[PDB]
Amino acid sequence: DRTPLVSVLLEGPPHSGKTALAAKIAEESNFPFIKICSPDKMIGFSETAKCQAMKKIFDDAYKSQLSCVVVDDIERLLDYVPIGPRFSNLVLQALLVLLKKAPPQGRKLLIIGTTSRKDVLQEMEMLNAFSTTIHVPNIATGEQLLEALELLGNFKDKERTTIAQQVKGKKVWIGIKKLLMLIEMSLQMDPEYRVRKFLALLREEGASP
Amino acid sequence: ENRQSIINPDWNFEKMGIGGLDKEFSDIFRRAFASRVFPPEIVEQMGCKHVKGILLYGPPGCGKTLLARQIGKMLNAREPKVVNGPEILNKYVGESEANIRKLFADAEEEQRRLGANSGLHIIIFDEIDAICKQRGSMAGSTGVHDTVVNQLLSKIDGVEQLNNILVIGMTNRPDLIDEALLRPGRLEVKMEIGLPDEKGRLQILHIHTARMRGHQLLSADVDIKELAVETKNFSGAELEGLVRAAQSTAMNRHIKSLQVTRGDFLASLENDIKPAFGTNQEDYASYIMNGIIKWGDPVTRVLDDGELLVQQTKNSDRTPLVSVLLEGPPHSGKTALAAKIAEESNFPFIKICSPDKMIGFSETAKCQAMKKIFDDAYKSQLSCVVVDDIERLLDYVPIGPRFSNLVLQALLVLLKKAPPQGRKLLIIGTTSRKDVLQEMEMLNAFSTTIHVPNIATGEQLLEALELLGNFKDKERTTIAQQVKGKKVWIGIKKLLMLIEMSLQMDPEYRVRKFLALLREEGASP
Ligand SMILES: Nc1ncnc2c1ncn2[C@@H]1O[C@H](COP(=O)(O)OP(=O)(O)OP(=O)(O)O)[C@@H](O)[C@H]1O
Numbered sequence: 001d002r003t004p005l006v007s008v009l010l011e012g013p014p015h016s017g018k019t020a021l022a023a024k025i026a027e028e029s030n031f032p033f034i035k036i037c038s039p040d041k042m043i044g045f046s047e048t049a050k051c052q053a054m055k056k057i058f059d060d061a062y063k064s065q066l067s068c069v070v071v072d073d074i075e076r077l078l079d080y081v082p083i084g085p086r087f088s089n090l091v092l093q094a095l096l097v098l099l100k101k102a103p104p105q106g107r108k109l110l111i112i113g114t115t116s117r118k119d120v121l122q123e124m125e126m127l128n129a130f131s132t133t134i135h136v137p138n139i140a141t142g143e144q145l146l147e148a149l150e151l152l153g154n155f156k157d158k159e160r161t162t163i164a165q166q167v168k169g170k171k172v173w174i175g176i177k178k179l180l181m182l183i184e185m186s187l188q189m190d191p192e193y194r195v196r197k198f199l200a201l202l203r204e205e206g207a208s209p
Numbered sequence: 210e211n212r213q214s215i216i217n218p219d220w221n222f223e224k225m226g227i228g229g230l231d232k233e234f235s236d237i238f239r240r241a242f243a244s245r246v247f248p249p250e251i252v253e254q255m256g257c258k259h260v261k262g263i264l265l266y267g268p269p270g271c272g273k274t275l276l277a278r279q280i281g282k283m284l285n286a287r288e289p290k291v292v293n294g295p296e297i298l299n300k301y302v303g304e305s306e307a308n309i310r311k312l313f314a315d316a317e318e319e320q321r322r323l324g325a326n327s328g329l330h331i332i333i334f335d336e337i338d339a340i341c342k343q344r345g346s347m348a349g350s351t352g353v354h355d356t357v358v359n360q361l362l363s364k365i366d367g368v369e370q371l372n373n374i375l376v377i378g379m380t381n382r383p384d385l386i387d388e389a390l391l392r393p394g395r396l397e398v399k400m401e402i403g404l405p406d407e408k409g410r411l412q413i414l415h416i417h418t419a420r421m422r423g424h425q426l427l428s429a430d431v432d433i434k435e436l437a438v439e440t441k442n443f444s445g446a447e448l449e450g451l452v453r454a455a456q457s458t459a460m461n462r463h464i465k466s467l468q469v470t471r472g473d474f475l476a477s478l479e480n481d482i483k484p485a486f487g488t489n490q491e492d493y494a495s496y497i498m499n500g501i502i503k504w505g506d507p508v509t510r511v512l513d514d515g516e517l518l519v520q521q522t523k524n525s526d527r528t529p530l531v532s533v534l535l536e537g538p539p540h541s542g543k544t545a546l547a548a549k550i551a552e553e554s555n556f557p558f559i560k561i562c563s564p565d566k567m568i569g570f571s572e573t574a575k576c577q578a579m580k581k582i583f584d585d586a587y588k589s590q591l592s593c594v595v596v597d598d599i600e601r602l603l604d605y606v607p608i609g610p611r612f613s614n615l616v617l618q619a620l621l622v623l624l625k626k627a628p629p630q631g632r633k634l635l636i637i638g639t640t641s642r643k644d645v646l647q648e649m650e651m652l653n654a655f656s657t658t659i660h661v662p663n664i665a666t667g668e669q670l671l672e673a674l675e676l677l678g679n680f681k682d683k684e685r686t687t688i689a690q691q692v693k694g695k696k697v698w699i700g701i702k703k704l705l706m707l708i709e710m711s712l713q714m715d716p717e718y719r720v721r722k723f724l725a726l727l728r729e730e731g732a733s734p
């Protein structure tokens with residue numbers, strides 16, 4: 001009763017699987033009003049149109065005893081580009097004002113945000129408007145890689161042994177989505193060179209933090 | 210008197226003249242008009258109103274109006290009132306509403322004169338999404354067409370009830386229409402009319418060749434299975450046009466047994482009909498000119514990689530969207546290799562997007578054009594879209610730097626949007642400045658990169674000269690001895706220019722000029 005409005009930020013390295021987890025968290029809450037505000041439905045719009053669209057969704061969220069609105073890929077909403085820098089200010093101000101406006105008496109809300117560049121957000125005075133943050137990590141240890149491979153269930157046993165032998169004595173820095181992509185890319189060779197090319201691709205992609 | 214005779218005395222479905230839709234009609238019949246044929250006693254006892262309109266959306270040319278007229282002619286209704294969207298608007302105050310208010314007059318009159326025993330009236334709209342758009346709310350920012358929508362909403366479902374009307378809307382942009390115009394009270398049933406598959410084309414050809422078959426004017430070699438398999442993404446209009454062109458070409462041939470034959474259909478298909486959701490040879494003929502000769506291994510490597518990527522995007526389901534980037538030094542012939550990789554794919558739908566057709570456009574128009582190409586690409590089951598120059602779209606220029614930001618965001622959002630369920634796509638890019646693209650953090654959107662190298666040895670140059678075939682053996686020996694040192698670094702679009710600039714010199718002051726030009730060009734990595 002002393003906190004009708006909450007917020008949270010999910011951030012981490014790219015290709016790490018952030019939007020899926022936000023969608024799952026929203027799905028498994030049993031609230032009666034769940035909505036997603038993504039930036040691929042606003043291709044070609046101007047600043048004012050984006051403001052009006054976000055405002056309309058939030059306005060609709062104020063007529064229900066419970067709600068959950070997801071706002072993903074903030075940096076695309078702002079139109080950030082490292083050169084300059086250059087972005088949109090009006091959308092930023094609207095977003096910074098909508099994050100601490102309470103609903104009418106007796107109603108509740110919950111906002112989840114997603115991003116991949118936390119420092120730039122910190123510069124613009126935006127980590128002060130959120131209530132907490134969570135961290136989504138990349139795959140770190142080779143045993144996790146083997147577990148993910150087995151759960152996906154793609155490579156056979158002896159191939160698993162070779163991969164484990166050559167990938168269990170070092171470090172690994174790979175995202176899950178990129179892992180799916182690499183597996184599918186490697187599966188197109190003849191049945192003899194599959195493991196060799198998978199190892200080559202993993203070695204090439206393997207980059208220091 | 211029981212009004213169970215709304216159904217016309219005799220009706221078959223397939224005889225109507227429509228072929229290719231069999232679940233759309235089934236669902237429409239079940240959900241909409243199952244209460245216009247049941248005996249009036251039960252309908253009256255249960256006390257239920259009737260559906261008051263429907264919406265139809267899909268591509269342009271797939272037979273929407275035909276279905277509306279057939280629906281109307283089913284229910285013994287009166288003559289439909291066909292209207293057009295942009296033909297209602299007017300410049301004076303109080304004219305558009307007057308036009309919109311003159312369609313519901315006869316229904317109201319006949320409701321007055323005979324209450325509850327009147328006949329169905331039908332109204333057919335067209336491009337409905339040109340008059341009705343979402344209404345604004347901010348004070349002082351209300352739109353300019355906020356009275357037409359009000360005057361239509363207040364009439365479809367108002368304070369005085371009309372129970373003898375049915376409204377059908379047709380549009381191609383289902384996402385621009387208002388939200389208060391689609392609640393279960395008005396225009397509640399929505400249907401999609403999509404491109405036909407093999408069975409659809411087979412039935413559409415049977416229907417349109419029934420007349421010729423009956424009149425004994427078809428030869429005994431023309432078979433419809435192969436003509437159905439040949440046409441890939443044809444709509445209905447382009448099938449009827451094909452049949453008509455075939456008959457006309459046969460008649461013209463007769464002028465010099467007037468029975469059409471395989472050859473007539475094949476010629477008409479090849480040279481008369483061009484689909485709008487299919488491949489076109491004009492682009493390949495215009496971009497790949499002077500052919501693709503081989504002068505080394507790199508060409509083979511590039512083509513092999515392209516083939517592998519095509520196979521992956523075809524035969525996988527975990528990743529229904531792929532991308533790739535071809536980058537190399539300027540003048541190295543990148544667009545031709547891209548258009549070649551696309552032409553060997555054997556995909557139903559191929560299209561090229563280049564800035565040659567957007568001279569003088571403001572950035573918003575460029576966004577619209579790119580978006581329209583992708584929107585069309587999302588309607589097929591396989592596709593391949595090429596983006597020609599990823600630096601002339603942004604308007605990059607080293608001073609500043611200066612460029613456009615709207616187009617860049619549109620492009621960065623369109624490289625990660627997957628197509629509707631169960632469809633596939635492939636994107637090929639091309640650029641000469643990898644580093645600048647890397648600075649804007651767009652070089653990690655593309656899945657993979659490929660390199661297009663340059664001439665780097667004497668024997669490669671000699672083999673290119675041999676393939677082009679312009680000099681004699683003694684001249685070849687002279688050039689080989691003069692440029693034996695392997696310090697050659699030239700493009701493959703510039704070598705043709707150097708050759709052609711020298712050939713028009715003089716009988717034997719040619720090779721001297723060619724060598725001088727080759728030396729002056731320089732060689733750096
Ligand atoms: N093996 C080859 N590879 C590429 N192009 C070739 C080859 N053989 C012949 N050509 C011809 O070379 C020309 C290459 O011109 P193209 O416009 O592709 O160059 P580009 O580098 O893309 O252009 P720009 O220099 O403006 O960036 C075409 O006319 C093509 O037919």
Ligand SMILES: Nc1ncnc2c1ncn2[C@@H]1O[C@H](COP(=O)(O)OP(=O)(O)O)[C@@H](O)[C@H]1O
Pocket residue numbers: 226227228229230268269270271272273274275413416445446449
């Ligand atoms: N399912 C179909 N079966 C047979 N012919 C069709 C079909 N769909 C369209 N056509 C042809 O298309 C023409 C009408 O197209 P039209 O209804 O004007 O398309 P749209 O409604 O998209 O404007 C007719 O001449 C008809 O022969």
